[PDB]
Amino acid sequence: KDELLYLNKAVVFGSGAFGTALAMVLSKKCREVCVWHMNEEEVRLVNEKRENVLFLKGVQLASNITFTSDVEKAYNGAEIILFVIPTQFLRGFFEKSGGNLIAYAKEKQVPVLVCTKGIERSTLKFPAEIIGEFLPSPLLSVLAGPSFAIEVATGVFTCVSIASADINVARRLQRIMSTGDRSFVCWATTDTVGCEVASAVKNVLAIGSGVANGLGMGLNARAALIMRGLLEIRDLTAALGGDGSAVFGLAGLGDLQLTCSSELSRNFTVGKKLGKGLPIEEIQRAVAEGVATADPLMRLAKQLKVKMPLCHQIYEIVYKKKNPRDALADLLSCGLQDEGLPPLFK
Amino acid sequence: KDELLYLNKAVVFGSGAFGTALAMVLSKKCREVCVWHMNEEEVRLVNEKRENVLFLKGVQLASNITFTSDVEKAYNGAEIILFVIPTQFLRGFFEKSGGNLIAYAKEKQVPVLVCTKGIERSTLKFPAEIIGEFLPSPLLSVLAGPSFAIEVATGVFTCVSIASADINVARRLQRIMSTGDRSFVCWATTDTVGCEVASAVKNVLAIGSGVANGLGMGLNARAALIMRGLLEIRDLTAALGGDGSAVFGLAGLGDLQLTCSSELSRNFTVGKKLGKGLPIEEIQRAVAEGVATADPLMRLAKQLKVKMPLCHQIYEIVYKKKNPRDALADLLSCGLQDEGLPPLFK
Ligand SMILES: CCCCCCCCCCCCCCCC(=O)O
Ligand SMILES: CCCCCCCCCCCCCCCC(=O)O
Ligand SMILES: Clc1nc(Br)nc2nc[nH]c12
Numbered sequence: 114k115d116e117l118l119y120l121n122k123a124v125v126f127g128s129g130a131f132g133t134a135l136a137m138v139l140s141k142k143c144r145e146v147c148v149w150h151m152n153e154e155e156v157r158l159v160n161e162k163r164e165n166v167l168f169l170k171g172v173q174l175a176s177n178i179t180f181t182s183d184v185e186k187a188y189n190g191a192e193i194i195l196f197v198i199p200t201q202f203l204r205g206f207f208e209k210s211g212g213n214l215i216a217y218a219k220e221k222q223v224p225v226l227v228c229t230k231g232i233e234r235s236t237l238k239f240p241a242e243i244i245g246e247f248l249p250s251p252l253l254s255v256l257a258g259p260s261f262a263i264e265v266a267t268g269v270f271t272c273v274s275i276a277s278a279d280i281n282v283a284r285r286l287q288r289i290m291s292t293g294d295r296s297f298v299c300w301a302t303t304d305t306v307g308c309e310v311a312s313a314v315k316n317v318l319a320i321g322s323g324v325a326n327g328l329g330m331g332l333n334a335r336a337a338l339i340m341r342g343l344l345e346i347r348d349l350t351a352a353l354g355g356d357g358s359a360v361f362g363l364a365g366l367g368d369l370q371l372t373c374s375s376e377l378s379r380n381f382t383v384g385k386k387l388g389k390g391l392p393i394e395e396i397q398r399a400v401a402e403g404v405a406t407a408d409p410l411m412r413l414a415k416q417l418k419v420k421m422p423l424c425h426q427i428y429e430i431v432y433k434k435k436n437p438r439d440a441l442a443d444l445l446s447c448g449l450q451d452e453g454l455p456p457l458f459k
Numbered sequence: 460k461d462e463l464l465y466l467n468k469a470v471v472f473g474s475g476a477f478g479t480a481l482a483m484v485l486s487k488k489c490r491e492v493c494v495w496h497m498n499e500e501e502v503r504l505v506n507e508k509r510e511n512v513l514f515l516k517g518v519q520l521a522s523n524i525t526f527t528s529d530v531e532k533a534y535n536g537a538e539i540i541l542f543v544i545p546t547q548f549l550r551g552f553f554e555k556s557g558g559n560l561i562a563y564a565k566e567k568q569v570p571v572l573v574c575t576k577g578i579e580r581s582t583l584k585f586p587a588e589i590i591g592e593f594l595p596s597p598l599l600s601v602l603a604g605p606s607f608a609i610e611v612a613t614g615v616f617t618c619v620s621i622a623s624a625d626i627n628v629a630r631r632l633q634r635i636m637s638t639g640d641r642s643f644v645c646w647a648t649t650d651t652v653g654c655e656v657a658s659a660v661k662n663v664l665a666i667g668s669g670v671a672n673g674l675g676m677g678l679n680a681r682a683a684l685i686m687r688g689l690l691e692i693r694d695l696t697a698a699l700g701g702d703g704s705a706v707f708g709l710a711g712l713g714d715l716q717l718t719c720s721s722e723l724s725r726n727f728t729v730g731k732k733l734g735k736g737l738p739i740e741e742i743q744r745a746v747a748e749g750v751a752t753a754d755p756l757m758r759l760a761k762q763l764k765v766k767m768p769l770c771h772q773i774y775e776i777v778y779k780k781k782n783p784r785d786a787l788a789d790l791l792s793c794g795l796q797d798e799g800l801p802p803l804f805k
C-alpha cells in the first residue's frame with residue numbers, strides 16, 4: 114500500500130549524527146521517539162539544550178525526541194527499533210544489555226532497522242548479520258542510501274533503500290520511514306548483502322578519492338574511482354551470496370558517489386594527506402571509518418578470494434606505508450582491458 | 460595487445476573544447492594532428508596564438524597541433540579520424556564536404572572515432588548512427604566517459620570507454636587513444652547505443668540537477684536524481700536495441716555523475732534559474748545542450764513508448780512552462796515502490 118504508517122513510539126539505539134537525523138525523520142511519523150545514549154550526564158545536557166550538541170550541532174530536536182540512557186525505558190512500547198550503534202560495540206551491547214530487549218522484540222514481533230555500517234574485526238561479519246545472531250532475521254531490514262545526516266535531519270529531500278530478504282518486510286518499513294511531506298522517500302529491495310557491502314566499502318573508497326585529490330588529480334579521476342570501485346562492491350557482494358540488486362541503486366552507486374564527493378569528510382581528508390605524502394601516524398589525531406574498515410575488508414576479501422584492486426591498494430597505502438604513486442602505478446600496470454560489465458539485454 | 464599504437468597523423472573534425480582536448484591527447488600518440496575549423500580567419504588566429512582562444516582558453520596547444528579550414532588537407536594522410544562536429548551540423552558536413560573524405564576513409568579503411576553527442580531533430584538518430592549513413596559501420600567506434608575537457612587537455616588522469624559493436628575495433632582504438640604516461644586510459648566495450656544514449660540524456664538530467672539546486676535541495680537529492688535518472692538511460696537504451704553494458708560503466712553512470720555535479724556548467728545554471736522561478740525566455744542568452752536535447756529526446760521516447768519520468772518532467776519545465784514544484788509533486792505522486800533493479804546473481 115502507498116499509504117503511510119504512523120506509530121506511537123520508535124526507539125533508536127545509537128546517538129550519532131545519523132541516528133539523530135533518523136530520529137528527526139521518525140519524529141514526524143511517531144508520537145514518541147526515544148534515542149538511547151549510554152552516558153547519563155550527556156543525556157541530560159542534550160535534553161536540556163534540546164539539541165544533540167555532541168554529534169549533530171546546530172539542529173534543534175523535535176520536542177517529541179527524548180534522549181535516555183535506560184535501555185529498558187528506551188525500547189518499552191516501541192513499535193520499530195533502529196540500531197545505529199557502532200559495529201565494534203554491537204555484539205557487546207546485546208550480550209550486556211539486550212536480554213530483555215531481545216525477548217520483547219521476539220514476543221511483540223517488532224521490526225528492526227539496521228543502520229549501522231562496517232565490518233566486525235573478530236568475525237568479519239556485517240552489522241545486520243551480527244544483529245541476526247540475536248534477533249530473528251525475518252524481523253530484520255537494512256537502511257542505506259545517499260543520506261548526509263544534516264540534510265536528513267533538516268528535512269532536505271532524501272531517497273534511501275530499505276532492504277530485506279523478504280520484500281514484504283522492506284515494503285512495510287517503507288511505509289513507516291517515508292514522510293508525509295515526501296522529504297524522506299524509501300525504495301524497497303531484497304539486497305541486504307549488497308547494502309551492507311556498499312556501506313562498508315564506500316568508506317575505504319572515499320579514502321582513495323582523497324588520495325586522488327592529494328595526488329593532484331581532478332574530477333575525471335574521482336568519477337573513474339567511483340565507477341571502478343563499484344565493481345569491487347559488486348564482486349564482493351557476489352562472493353558473499355548477495356543477490357546484488359542494490360549495487361547499482363541508491364545503497365550502492367548512489368551512496369558511493371555521494372560519499373566519495375564529500376571533500377570535508379574525515380575519510381577524504383585522511384586520503385588527501387596521504388596523497389600529499391604525510392605518513393598515517395602523523396595524520397592519526399578520531400579514526401576515519403575507512404581506515405578502520407580497510408583491514409577487515411582485505412581479510413574478508415582474501416578469505417573469499419575476491420580481487421579488489423582499489424581497496425587493496427588503499428589498504429597498502431594506509432597500513433603498509435606504500436607510496437601513493439607506487440600504488441597508482443601498480444594499479445595501472447594491468448594493461449589495456451575491456452570494461453568488465455555484462456550486457457543487460459540480449 | 461597492451462602495447463600502444465603510435466601514428467603519423469590524426470585528424471579531428473570539430474574545434475570545440477572537447478575536440479581540442481582530444482587533439483592534445485592525440486598529440487602525444489601521433490606526430491601530426493590536424494584540427495579542422497570552418498572559419499579560416501579564426502584558424503589563423505588560433506595557429507598564431509598557439510591556443511584555441513575560442514573554446515579552450517588558457518591551454519597551450521602542442522606544437523604538433525595545427526588548425527586548418529581545408530577539409531582535404533585536414534584528413535589527407537590521417538590514420539584516425541575523430542568527429543566532434545555538433546549533431547545539427549553533422550549531416551550537412553558530409554553532404555557538402557565529405558565526398559572525398561568518405562572515399563578516402565573507405566579506401567584506406569581508416570578508423571573513425573565518434574565524439575559528437577546529441578540527437579538530430581529531423582530523424583531522431585544519434586551521431587554515430589548519422590555518421591554510419593556515410594561511413595561503413597565496421598569502421599565506427601564511440602568515445603564516452605567522465606572527461607571534463609580542461610582536465611583532459613592538461614593531462615590530468617582520465618578514464619573513458621571506447622565502444623564498437625565489434626570489440627576488436629574498440630580494442631585497437633584503445634591502443635591509439637591511450638597515452639604512454641597513463642594519464643588517458645581507455646576501456647573497451649560493445650555498447651555503442653548505451654554510450655550515445657547516456658551522452659545525450661546526461662545533458663537533460665543535468666538541467667534537472669540544476670533545478671534541484673534552485674529548489675533548495677541538497678546533495679542527497681542530486682545523488683537520487685543521478686541514480687533514478689540512470690534507469691531512464693537504461694530503459695531507452697533497451698528500446699533502441701542496445702546491449703546496455705555501458706550503462707553502469709564510465710560512459711553511463713560515470714559520465715552522468717560527473718556531468719550532474721558540474722555546478723558551473725550551462726545545463727546546471729539553466730536548471731538552477733528555472734528552479735528559482737525564472738522563465739526560460741529570460742534565461743535564454745548560448746543554448747544549453749540539455750535544452751536543445753530535451754525535445755527530440757521526448758519525441759524519441761514517445762515514439763518508442765519508453766517512460767522517462769525525470770526527463771519528461773524536465774522537458775515540461777523547459778518547454779511547457781511547468782512550475783518546478785508542480786513537476787516534483789507529480790514525480791513523487793507515484794506512490795511507494797520497489798527500486799526497480801534486477802538481481803545480478805541468482
Ligand atoms: C589508493 C590509490 C588511489 C588512487 C586513485 C586513482 C584515481 C582513480 C583510478 C581509477 C583507475 C582504475 C584502475 C583499475 C585498474 C585495475 O582494474 O586493476
Ligand atoms: C525537473 C524536476 C527535477 C527535480 C529533481 C528532484 C531531485 C531528485 C528527485 C529524484 C526522485 C526520483 C523520483 C522517481 C519517481 C518516479 O519513478 O516516477
Ligand atoms: Cl562500550 C560502548 N557501548 C556502546 Br553500545 N556504545 C558506545 N559508544 C562508545 N562506547 C560505547
Ligand SMILES: Clc1nc(Br)nc2nc[nH]c12
Nearest residue numbers: 497544545548549551552
Ligand atoms: Cl554550417 C556549420 N558547419 C559545421 Br561542420 N560546423 C559549424 N559550426 C558552426 N556552424 C557550423
